[PDB]
Amino acid sequence: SSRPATARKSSGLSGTVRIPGDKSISHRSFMFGGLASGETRITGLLEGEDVINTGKAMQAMGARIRKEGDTWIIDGVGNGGLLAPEAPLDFGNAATGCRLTMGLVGVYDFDSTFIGDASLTKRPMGRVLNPLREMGVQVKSEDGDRLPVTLRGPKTPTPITYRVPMASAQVKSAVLLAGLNTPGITTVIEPIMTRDHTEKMLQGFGANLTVETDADGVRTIRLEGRGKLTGQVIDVPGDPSSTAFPLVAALLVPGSDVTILNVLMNPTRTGLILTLQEMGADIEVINPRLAGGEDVADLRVRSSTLKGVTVPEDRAPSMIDEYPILAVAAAFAEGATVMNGLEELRVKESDRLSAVANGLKLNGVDCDEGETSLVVRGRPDGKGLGNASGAAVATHLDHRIAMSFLVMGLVSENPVTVDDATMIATSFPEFMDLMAGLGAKIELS
Numbered sequence: 001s002s003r004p005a006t007a008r009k010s011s012g013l014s015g016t017v018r019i020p021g022d023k024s025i026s027h028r029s030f031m032f033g034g035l036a037s038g039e040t041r042i043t044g045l046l047e048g049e050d051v052i053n054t055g056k057a058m059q060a061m062g063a064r065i066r067k068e069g070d071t072w073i074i075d076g077v078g079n080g081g082l083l084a085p086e087a088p089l090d091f092g093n094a095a096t097g098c099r100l101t102m103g104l105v106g107v108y109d110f111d112s113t114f115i116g117d118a119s120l121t122k123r124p125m126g127r128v129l130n131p132l133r134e135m136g137v138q139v140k141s142e143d144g145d146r147l148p149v150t151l152r153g154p155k156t157p158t159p160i161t162y163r164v165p166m167a168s169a170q171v172k173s174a175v176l177l178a179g180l181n182t183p184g185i186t187t188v189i190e191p192i193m194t195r196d197h198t199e200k201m202l203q204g205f206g207a208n209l210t211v212e213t214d215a216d217g218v219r220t221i222r223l224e225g226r227g228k229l230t231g232q233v234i235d236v237p238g239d240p241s242s243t244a245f246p247l248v249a250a251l252l253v254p255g256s257d258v259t260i261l262n263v264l265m266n267p268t269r270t271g272l273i274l275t276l277q278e279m280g281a282d283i284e285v286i287n288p289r290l291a292g293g294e295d296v297a298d299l300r301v302r303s304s305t306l307k308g309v310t311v312p313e314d315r316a317p318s319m320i321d322e323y324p325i326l327a328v329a330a331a332f333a334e335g336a337t338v339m340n341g342l343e344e345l346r347v348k349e350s351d352r353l354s355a356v357a358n359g360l361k362l363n364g365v366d367c368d369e370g371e372t373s374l375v376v377r378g379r380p381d382g383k384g385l386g387n388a389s390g391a392a393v394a395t396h397l398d399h400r401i402a403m404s405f406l407v408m409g410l411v412s413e414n415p416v417t418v419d420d421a422t423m424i425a426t427s428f429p430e431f432m433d434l435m436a437g438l439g440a441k442i443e444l445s
């Protein structure tokens with residue numbers, strides 16, 4: 001069922017910790033490793049529930065996955081080698097695994113069924129099912145193009161040129177993965193850049209995939225279908241979204257000095273850091289380097305006084321999953337923090353705009369929720385914030401609502417309670433232990 005947790009004011013967070021692996025890259029490591037020819041070896045994999053579900057889906061289609069020591073070793077089936085799954089592919093809470101896998105196997109000439117939990121089952125799949133219909137996939141979905149969904153690919157899929165209508169890396173990725181088993185050239189046009197793990201990793205696995213960027217920023221990504229993919233050695237960098245929790249906690253809790261090691265610094269993932277620096281955050285980027293083909297660095301974070309800023313709609317894609325924690329940081333900043341271009345938040349694990357606004361109000365924060373925006377006015381000393389009565393923030397099965405408000409409780413005058421901590425393990429099973437090690441006091445029911 002549900003397991004509430006309460007965060008209490010901290011006298012200071014301090015230490016050096018390695019953050020768990022990046023979820024996006026981890027999902028793709030299991031997918032590409034499972035599809036490629038030969039062996040793939042992965043170090044640093046995030047072992048949260050979302051990623052484990054993608055792994056089980058790949059095994060269901062023929063890939064052999066095992067963990068030897070600290071390395072996940074995968075024996076892939078080779079491009080075009082996926083086998084028809086016996087039962088529905090259960091993605092639990094993970095749309096990344098669900099949506100990318102719909103593109104990956106939907107173009108195969110067999111039936112595949114997709115299911116998930118109460119949260120995933122309410123999320124929109126039309127954004128990926130429409131391009132798949134264009135490629136010739138037959139779709140059976142619940143009203144509104146929601147799960148459960150059953151796909152049946154054509155004998156010969158049709159390659160398309162698809163302009164992604166919203167800033168979704170998952171839609172871009174689903175079309176590219178469908179292209180892997182489609183003869184001809186699949187093209188995805190992305191008017192606004194989104195995380196590029198699919199492009200980078202597929203190139204690393206040997207795909208004839210190219211990215212061309214116009215001076216106006218529009219990206220044209222071309223993929224030649226049915227080409228060989230070769231298993232690779234993958235070193236997964238630290239998750240920058242997970243990093244956000246101890247990083248923001250250290251900025252807000254007085255007397256803090258926290259260093260997070262091996263953090264992914266791809267700029268499509270660092271909008272929150274840039275925003276916090278604009279707010280006056282003391283975040284030092286240490287030893288920027290190349291590791292596993294990605295940009296990484298260690299981040300030293302110290303207590304800072306913050307001032308509200310206006311965050312432009314075009315930075316949104318580079319920090320879309322960090323709006324919840326940014327809203328909590330804004331609750332302690334001087335003045336108003338204004339964030340627009342937030343329509344995508346309404347279709348995540350929870351409607352995040354509604355969940356964040358409601359959670360902030362329950363904890364005494366002055367904020368204004370708009371259809372696609374949020375304004376937060378802060379109280380730097382934290383006085384009057386939190387909830388003395390112990391009322392619980394509704395998490396709506398969303399791991400980041402749970403984590404963001406638990407961080408808030410380490411700073412506010414009154415404790416902050418979340419109605420459920422059980423979904424935190426979908427992306428950051430180490431959260432409680434990691435925060436406790438730094439000094440945070442979080443009581444699980």
Ligand SMILES: O=C(O)C1=C[C@@H](OP(=O)(O)O)[C@@H](O)[C@H](O)C1
Binds near residue numbers: 024096170171195321
């Ligand atoms: O492709 C990916 O790895 C992801 C893309 C994003 O979703 P959208 O494509 O829906 O924006 C992000 O929020 C999710 O956690 C992972």
Ligand SMILES: O=C(O)C[NH2+]CP(=O)(O)O
Binds near residue numbers: 050094097321400
């Ligand atoms: O991790 C996040 O904050 C949002 N996306 C989760 P997914 O789309 O994979 O379910």
